[PDB]
Amino acid sequence: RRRIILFPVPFQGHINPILQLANVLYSKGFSITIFHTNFNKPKTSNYPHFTFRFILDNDPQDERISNLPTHGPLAGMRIPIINEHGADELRRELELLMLASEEDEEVSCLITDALWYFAQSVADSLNLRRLVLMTSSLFNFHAHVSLPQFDELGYLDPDDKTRLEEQASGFPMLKVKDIKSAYSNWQILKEILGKMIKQTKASSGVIWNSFKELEESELETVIREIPAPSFLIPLPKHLTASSSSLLDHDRTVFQWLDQQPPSSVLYVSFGSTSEVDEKDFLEIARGLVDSKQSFLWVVRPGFVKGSTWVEPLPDGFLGERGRIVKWVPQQEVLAHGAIGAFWTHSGWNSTLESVCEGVPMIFSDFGLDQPLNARYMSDVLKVGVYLENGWERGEIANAIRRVMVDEEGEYIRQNARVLKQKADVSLMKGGSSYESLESLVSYISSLT
Ligand SMILES: C=C1C[C@@]23CC[C@H]4[C@@](C)(CCC[C@@]4(C)C(=O)O)[C@@H]2CC[C@]1(O[C@@H]1O[C@H](CO)[C@@H](O)[C@H](O[C@@H]2O[C@H](CO)[C@@H](O)[C@H](O)[C@H]2O)[C@H]1O[C@@H]1O[C@H](CO)[C@@H](O)[C@H](O)[C@H]1O)C3
Ligand SMILES: O=c1ccn([C@@H]2O[C@H](COP(=O)(O)OP(=O)(O)O)[C@@H](O)[C@H]2O)c(=O)[nH]1
Question: What span, in angstroms and rounded, lies between the C-alpha atoms of 123 and 7?
Answer without folding.
Answer: 12
